[PDB]
């Protein structure tokens, strides 16, 4: 808690590390949520929802 909260505000290197970590985690979390809602909005329309997927003849 207070250790990181005192390092981030007092040393720019720690703040820069915090920015990089936040970018990484936030971009992954939005990629994940945006794909979850995309999957929910398109039920049955996926390539792997094809019933005959695997029998061409």
């Amino acid at each position: 808690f207070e250790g990181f909260y005192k390092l981030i505000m007092r040393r720019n290197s720690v703040y820069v590390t915090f920015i990089i970590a936040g970018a990484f985690f936030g971009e992954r979390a939005v990629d994940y949520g945006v794909h979850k809602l995309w999957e929910r909005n398109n039920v049955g329309k996926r390539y792997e929802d094809i019933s005959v997927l695997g029998q061409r003849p």
Binding site: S13, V14, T17, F24
Partner: peptide, 28 residues
């Protein structure tokens, strides 16, 4: 303020390298 700063800026550089290049799988 010289060794601590060097360690901090090295940690930031390593984190930025892990963030730009994401070799999750090269931990072998």
């Amino acid at each position: 303020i010289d060794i601590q700063a060097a360690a901090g800026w090295g940690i930031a550089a390593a984190a930025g390298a892990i963030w730009v290049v994401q070799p999750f799988g090269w931990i072998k």
